[PDB]
Ligand binder design. Structure first.
Ligand code: MYR
Ligand code: MYR
Ligand code: MYR
Ligand code: MYR
Ligand code: MYR
Ligand code: MYR
Ligand code: MYR
Ligand code: MYR
Ligand code: MYR
Ligand code: CO
Ligand code: CO
Ligand code: CO
Ligand code: CO
Ligand code: CO
Length: 584
């Protein structure tokens, strides 16, 4: 593929709207400090040129590559040295040194102030009176604050925001319609950003063979009709894409992703029937659509796994030939038969098979050792399926909020060293995971759980590893991504914990609670419970339930009477002393 102008060629394939979006994101992930209206100029300056070249590729500078045009344009920026400093020094570099120089001088935390959400009225009003300026500003604002976030992915999110505004701004109780959707998108925004980063860290730390294992597992579930060769092909293609995107070049990453889809949509018949709609969709959309594609039908009359991977003298031979191609096959075969399983569960099986196979092989006669490998799998399978039942049962009894509280207590006792604000949010978000996935039938519970659990455990591990307080959490966090959730599951109640000293103000409450969002109210209620538990690790549901119900009664009482503030302090003082006796 070669065009005289690539800038002319890109302008057409993407379409001007997507084109004017990306360029804005592009120049916003670099030049995070420059004001909006400047970028808007720059965007338009590019966009004019882009059009000059669309009209005639022979036009001057149209021939020059995106990498050259983009770089030249960045060096055009006046006050580049005043604000961007060493980034300016990049301009004396000749491509591809200069482009690499730019990537290096991205700032992952520009110390920009928190992006504050206006009131619904203000947004809808601005949205109406100025749609583009409204939407682009925030696109700009998000892209500069998140310079490594994959630009197309950001764009897909921006078009969803537009949707929520368009629907909600027309209706009554817009805030009721809108605020949910805006949080939902934000939560997803973080999840996406974290999931992207988790893909790159895993590849760096645990390596590429690990990466591919995770990939084989996942694709074999996604594409059960495909042969091991074809999975294996796609796994090696997919890893390379990740390896280019983790470096952080957008164009290269995008081209690799586009290529990988191009291939997939040509060989649909070889992979999955579910690709048809995705492949019709436009290029940016196609890559996204493949990633999210439904699992294909698992072929019927599938042979038992105990034939090829047990009951076969050649296994010890074949394992040795290629430890990874055989193991990979086993994973492929096990996985395509188990879409109901979590990716990490399948790796625990493959890992087990390998450990068994290596130890068994070259010792005595192998058959007698490798005979019971499949039995070793059953305990591993049961453990995560047990937890789902136990948790989804308790969830259905208690309901989300109360479930979050059951969680809060449990975890505080295990890891009291963790900051209250972190204990709350993790316990809240875990509530949401069981809320979402317990609604699924027995199948798809684990794959649902895994993906949602990964984000929460990552949020915590990312947040904790900046300010560590627990060796037990650190161990889990810096452990293999296969063993990460089991480690957390394994955490036992720490007997060594010296309780938190009482403080009145913590357990003091004001009438402000009465008029407050339930979430905000819950957070503070929830906060007190954590503090309560940190004070009294030797508290027990029998004793704890009492105190929680008296607090339930203390709050409904004062918020009901006319002079709430007096009640709150005076009743609280009773509530404290009473409870303090009840827990000691
Ligand atoms: C990637 C999204 C670009 C367009 C966003 C439209 C405006 C979003 C609402 C204003 C800021 C919301 C902040 C937040 O949700 O935390
Ligand atoms: C909020 C904007 C959502 C679009 C994706 C960008 C990354 C979101 C992270 C938001 C956050 O840090 O709370
Ligand atoms: C993209 C396939 C290979 C990925 C191998 C590393 C996986 C790291 C953990 C990913 C957690 C998020 C799960 C997901 O991708 O939906
Ligand atoms: C830090 C240099 C590597 C750049 C990799 C870019 C693509 C993966 C990361 C995207 C999410 C960034 C999250 C973060 O680091 O805060
Ligand atoms: C399941 C098959 C996936 C085919 C699509 C290619 C996915 C490669 C991901 C490259 C990094 C993009 C980061 C993101 O998800 O925003
Ligand atoms: C760091 C966590 C993941 C480590 C890998 C655990 C599973 C072991 C078997 C790996 C199979 C390799 C197959 C392949 O790469 O083609
Ligand atoms: C705390 C919320 C509970 C929701 C249900 C999930 C229970 C944990 C089981 C996780 C199994 C998938 C991950 C893994 O294989 O380790
Ligand atoms: C700091 C909070 C730690 C959260 C750990 C969550 C582990 C996955 C949930 C599965 C249920 C087991 C919980 C546990 O044993 O701690
Ligand atoms: C022993 C010191 C005084 C303790 C006062 C009560 C502490 C627990 C308050 C938070 C738990 C209530 C949550 C709820 O029932 O919704
Ligand atoms: Co093209
Ligand atoms: Co109007
Ligand atoms: Co490439
Ligand atoms: Co998506
Ligand atoms: Co789901």
């Amino acid at each position: 593929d070669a065009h005289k102008s690539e800038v002319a060629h890109r302008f057409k394939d993407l379409g001007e709207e997507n084109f004017k979006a990306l360029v804005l994101i592009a120049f916003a992930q670099y030049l995070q400090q420059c004001p909006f209206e400047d970028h808007v100029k720059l965007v338009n300056e590019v966009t004019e040129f882009a059009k000059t070249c669309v009209a005639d590729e022979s036009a001057e500078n149209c021939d020059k590559s995106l990498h050259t045009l983009f770089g030249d344009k960045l060096c055009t920026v006046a006050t580049l040295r005043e604000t961007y400093g060493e980034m300016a020094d990049c301009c004396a570099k000749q491509e591809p040194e200069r482009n690499e120089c730019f990537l290096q001088h991205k700032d992952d935390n520009p110390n920009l102030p928190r992006l504050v959400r206006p009131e619904v009225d203000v947004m809808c009003t601005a949205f109406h009176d100025n749609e583009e300026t409204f939407l682009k500003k925030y696109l700009y604002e998000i892209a500069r604050r998140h310079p490594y976030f994959y630009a197309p992915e950001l764009l897909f999110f921006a078009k969803r925001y537009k949707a929520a505004f368009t629907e909600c701004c027309q209706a009554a109780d817009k805030a009721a319609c809108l605020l949910p959707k805006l949080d939902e998108l934000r939560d997803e925004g973080k999840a996406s950003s974290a999931k992207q980063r988790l893909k790159c860290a895993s590849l760096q730390k645990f390596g590429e063979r690990a990466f591919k294992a995770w990939a084989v597992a996942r694709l074999s579930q996604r594409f059960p009709k495909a042969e091991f060769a074809e999975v294996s092909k796609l796994v090696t293609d997919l890893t390379k894409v990740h390896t280019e995107c983790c470096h952080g070049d957008l164009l290269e990453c995008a081209d690799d992703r586009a290529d990988l889809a191009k291939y997939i949509c040509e060989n649909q018949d070889s992979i999955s029937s579910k690709l048809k709609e995705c492949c019709e969709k436009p290029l940016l959309e196609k890559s996204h659509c493949i990633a999210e594609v439904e699992n294909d039908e698992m072929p019927a009359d599938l042979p038992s796994l105990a034939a090829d991977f047990v009951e076969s003298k050649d296994v010890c031979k074949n394992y040795a030939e290629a430890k990874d191609v055989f193991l990979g096959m086993f994973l492929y075969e096990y996985a395509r038969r188990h879409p109901d399983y979590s990716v990490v569960l399948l790796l625990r099986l493959a890992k087990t098979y390998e450990t068994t196979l290596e130890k068994c092989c070259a010792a005595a006669d192998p058959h007698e050792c490798y005979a019971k490998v499949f039995d070793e799998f059953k305990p591993l399978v049961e453990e995560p399926q047990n937890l789902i039942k136990q948790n989804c049962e308790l969830f259905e009894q208690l309901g989300e909020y109360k479930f979050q509280n059951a969680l809060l207590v449990r975890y505080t006792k295990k890891v009291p060293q963790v900051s209250t604000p972190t204990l709350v949010e993790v316990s809240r978000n875990l509530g949401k995971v069981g809320s979402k996935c317990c609604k699924h039938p027995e199948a798809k519970r684990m794959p649902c759980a895994e993906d949602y659990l990964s984000v929460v455990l990552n949020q915590l591990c990312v947040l904790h590893e900046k300010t560590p307080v627990s060796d037990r959490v650190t161990k889990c966090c810096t452990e293999s991504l296969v063993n990460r959730r089991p480690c957390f599951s394994a955490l036992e109640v720490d007997e060594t914990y010296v309780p938190k000293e009482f403080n009145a103000e913590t357990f003091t409450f004001h009438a402000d609670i009465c008029t407050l969002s339930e979430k905000e109210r819950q957070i503070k209620k929830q906060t007190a419970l954590v503090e309560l538990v940190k004070h009294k690790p030797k508290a027990t549901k029998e004793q704890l339930k009492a105190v929680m119900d008296d607090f339930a009664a203390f709050v409904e009482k004062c918020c009901k009477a006319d002079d709430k503030e007096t009640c709150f302090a005076e009743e609280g003082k009773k509530l404290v002393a009473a409870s303090q006796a009840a827990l000691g």
